[PDB]
């Protein structure tokens, strides 16, 4: 089949992160050196150089705010980061470069919009390898709005925060650009990794894999060393959207399990509407969020990965109301914080007469929150011959589809039932022709005919449905694939809305 496809122009050059613009169809493609835009249709339009520069590792402040006496390189630019900001209709994108350049570009041409300051705190890290650093943007009505970030910061725990809320200021010209939403001596809106915990730990970091909006707060998913073989944890992160001091912080860990075996490595994650089977299942409405991930088996190697993979789903309200009891017992004095990378020490729950209503936000005790009391996933799907690596979902028809990349470069189609079943893999497609890796990164067309999913070197325009290969109704009713419908007036099987 004639699939469209976008090659990356150069061997070296490969794709980072991608995202559709939800209501032009703008593919806006990050990668190695360049920020593409492409039409619907897969179609270069605008290519734009962000590399490479000279530029050295050792230098900091970097090179954009001061000469540094280091041997320089042409050093590559790492898409870290590209989320379109819709609000403000503008894209916004982050690179390896002179220590973490975030530069706000522009929808129609992508022409820099808005360079930061020469404040070298507005730049976020000089990690350069992908799938370490999340954003959310966060403009709730009334204010200028702000960016919710997580980074990897490789050791230099003075020079970025782990965990920060910057400004992203309506004003595109503004100096405000990346500033921290609060900064005075003690209290700001950002987290530090303490010294005493990579002292503590060898290569101690904390990769940010996801994060998202929802109702009143934003998640981040972080993977992590943990604090004294190889022992590794997934998180949930959640704040409130409105709370500059971060006092709202608090961190639990999460995984799903499926016969016996556990799975305790989050290696993808994505938001989306609940099925109508998984909605029933939750007892959430089904407007409510659910978090679909992937993880691997155990809690050993994140960086030499096995096999072993499950996709499972996370209800928000699970996770809010997880979190709502977690703050409840530990405000009647009941157990500690548990969050030892970050404390550094035992620190005993203050009993406090504080009631924790639907919507708390913390106060100056009690936080930050941890917890060692995992939030359990629904596992949805199992398999140990691929290894999966991407997940992204939506809604047909009160029926959940899933879409599961592999190491293999195949995307399943799994259609949730919830209990006891789980959910049934429909359907495979290869879409890699040689086998390579599929990125965490897909997205659908603006009115989701499609899903464009991605490799290191390609870039394909994969359609949701193929009803036409079900030749008769008793293979075309047979196979599960939730779009099709079985044609009167035509004798084919295809979707609904034409027939
Ligand atoms: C989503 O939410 C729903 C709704 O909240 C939830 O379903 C409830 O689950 C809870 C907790 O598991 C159940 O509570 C248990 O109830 C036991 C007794 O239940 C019987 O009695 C119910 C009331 O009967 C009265 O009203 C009916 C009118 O319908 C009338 O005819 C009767 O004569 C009587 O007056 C009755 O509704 C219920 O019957 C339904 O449910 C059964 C399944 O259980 C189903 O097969 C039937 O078809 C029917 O729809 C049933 O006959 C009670 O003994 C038990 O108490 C123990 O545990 C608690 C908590 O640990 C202790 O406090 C207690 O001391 C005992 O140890 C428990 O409270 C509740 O019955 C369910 N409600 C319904 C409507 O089904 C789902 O779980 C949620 N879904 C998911 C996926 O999570
Ligand atoms: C990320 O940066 C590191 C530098 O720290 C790069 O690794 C270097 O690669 C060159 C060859 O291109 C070698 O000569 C050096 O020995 C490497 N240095 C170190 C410290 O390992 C790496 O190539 C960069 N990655 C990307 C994707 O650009
Ligand atoms: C894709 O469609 C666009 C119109 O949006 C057209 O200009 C372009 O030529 C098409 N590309 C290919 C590769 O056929």
Same mark, same amino acid.
């Given at each position: 089949?004639?699939?469209?496809?976008?090659?990356?122009?150069?061997?070296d050059?490969?794709?980072?992160?991608?995202?559709?613009?939800?209501?032009?169809?703008?593919?806006?493609?990050?990668?190695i050196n360049?920020?593409?835009?492409?039409?619907?249709?897969?179609?270069?339009?605008?290519?734009?150089?962000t590399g490479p520069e000279e530029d050295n590792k050792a230098c900091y402040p970097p090179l954009i705010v001061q000469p540094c006496s280091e041997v320089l390189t042409l050093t590559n630019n790492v898409n870290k980061?590209?989320?379109?900001?819709?609000?403000?209709?503008?894209?916004?994108?982050c690179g390896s470069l002179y220590q973490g350049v975030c530069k706000?570009?522009?929808?129609?041409?992508?022409?820099?919009?808005?360079?930061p300051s020469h404040k070298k705190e507005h730049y976020l890290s000089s990690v350069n390898k992908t799938?370490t650093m999340?954003?959310?943007?966060?403009?709730?009505?009334?204010?200028?709005?702000?960016?919710?970030?997580?980074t990897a910061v490789d050791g230099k725990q003075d020079y970025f925060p782990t965990?920060?809320?910057?400004?992203?200021?309506?004003?595109?010209?503004?100096?405000? /650009?990346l500033?921290?939403?609060?900064?005075?001596?003690?209290?700001?809106?950002?987290?530090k990794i303490?010294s005493?915990?990579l002292a503590?730990?060898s290569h101690f970091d904390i990769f940010?894999?996801?994060?998202?909006?929802?109702?009143?707060?934003?998640?981040?998913?972080?993977?992590?060393?943990?604090?004294?073989?190889?022992?590794?944890?997934?998180?949930?992160?959640?704040?409130?959207?409105?709370?500059?001091?971060?006092?709202?912080?608090?961190?639990?860990?999460?995984?799903?399990?499926?016969?016996?075996?556990?799975?305790?490595?989050?290696?993808?994650?994505?938001?989306?509407?609940?099925?109508?089977?998984?909605?029933?299942?939750?007892?959430?409405?089904?407007?409510?969020?659910?978090?679909?991930?992937?993880?691997?088996?155990?809690?050993?190697?994140?960086?030499?990965?096995?096999?072993?993979?499950?996709?499972?789903?996370?209800?928000?309200?699970?996770?809010?109301?997880?979190?709502?009891?977690?703050?409840?017992?530990?405000?009647?004095?009941?157990?500690?914080?548990?969050?030892?990378?970050?404390?550094?020490?035992?620190?005993?729950?203050? %009993?406090?007469?504080?009631?924790?209503?639907?919507?708390?936000?913390?106060?100056?005790?009690?936080?930050?929150?941890?917890?060692?009391?995992?939030?359990?996933?629904?596992?949805?799907?199992?398999?140990?011959?691929?290894?999966?690596?991407?997940?992204?979902?939506?809604?047909?028809?009160?029926?959940?589809?899933?879409?599961?990349?592999?190491?293999?470069?195949?995307?399943?189609?799994?259609?949730?039932?919830?209990?006891?079943?789980?959910?049934?893999?429909?359907?495979?497609?290869?879409?890699? %022709?040689?086998?390579?890796?599929?990125?965490?990164? /897909?997205?659908?067309?603006?009115?989701?005919?499609?899903?464009?999913? /991605?490799?290191?070197?390609?870039?394909?325009?994969?359609?949701?449905?193929?009803?036409?290969?079900?030749?008769?109704?008793?293979?075309?009713?047979?196979?599960?694939?939730?779009?099709?419908?079985?044609?009167?007036?035509?004798?084919?099987?295809?979707?609904?809305?034409?027939?």
């Open positions: 089949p004639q699939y469209s496809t976008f090659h990356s122009e150069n061997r050059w490969t794709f980072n992160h991608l995202t559709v613009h939800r209501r032009t169809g703008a593919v806006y493609v990050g990668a360049r920020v593409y835009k492409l039409t619907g249709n897969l179609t270069i339009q605008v290519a734009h150089k980061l590209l989320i379109i900001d819709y609000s403000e209709n503008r894209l916004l994108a706000l570009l522009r929808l129609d041409d992508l022409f820099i919009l808005v360079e799938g999340y954003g959310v943007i966060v403009r709730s009505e009334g204010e200028d709005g702000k960016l919710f970030i997580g965990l920060s809320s910057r400004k992203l200021p309506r004003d595109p010209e503004s100096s405000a /650009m500033d921290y939403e609060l900064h005075s001596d003690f209290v700001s809106s950002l987290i303490p005493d915990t503590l730990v940010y894999i996801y994060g998202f909006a929802s109702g009143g707060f934003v998640y981040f998913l972080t993977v992590q060393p943990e604090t004294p073989d190889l022992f590794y944890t997934s998180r949930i992160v959640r704040l409130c959207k409105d709370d500059p001091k971060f006092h709202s912080y608090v961190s639990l860990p999460f995984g799903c399990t499926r016969a016996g075996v556990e799975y305790r490595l989050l290696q993808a994650a994505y938001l989306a509407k609940p099925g109508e089977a998984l909605a029933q299942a939750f007892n959430i409405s089904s407007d409510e969020d659910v978090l679909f991930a992937i993880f691997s088996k155990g809690q050993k190697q994140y960086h030499h990965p096995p096999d072993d993979s499950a996709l499972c789903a996370f209800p928000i309200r699970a996770i809010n109301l997880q979190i709502k009891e977690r703050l409840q017992s530990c405000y009647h004095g009941e157990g500690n914080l548990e969050l030892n990378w970050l404390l550094g020490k035992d620190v005993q729950c203050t %009993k406090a007469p504080v009631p924790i209503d639907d919507n708390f936000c913390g106060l100056d005790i009690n936080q930050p929150l941890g917890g060692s009391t995992p939030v359990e996933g629904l596992t949805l799907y199992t398999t140990s011959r691929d290894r999966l690596t991407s997940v992204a979902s939506y809604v047909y028809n009160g029926y959940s589809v899933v879409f599961v990349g592999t190491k293999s470069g195949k995307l399943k189609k799994i259609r949730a039932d919830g209990p006891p079943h789980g959910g049934v893999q429909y359907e495979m497609v290869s879409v890699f %022709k040689d086998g390579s890796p599929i990125l965490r990164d /897909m997205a659908f067309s603006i009115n989701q005919l499609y899903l464009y999913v /991605m490799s290191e070197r390609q870039v394909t325009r994969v359609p949701v449905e193929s009803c036409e290969q079900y030749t008769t109704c008793g293979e075309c009713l047979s196979s599960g694939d939730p779009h099709c419908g079985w044609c009167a007036l035509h004798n084919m099987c295809s979707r609904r809305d034409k027939c």
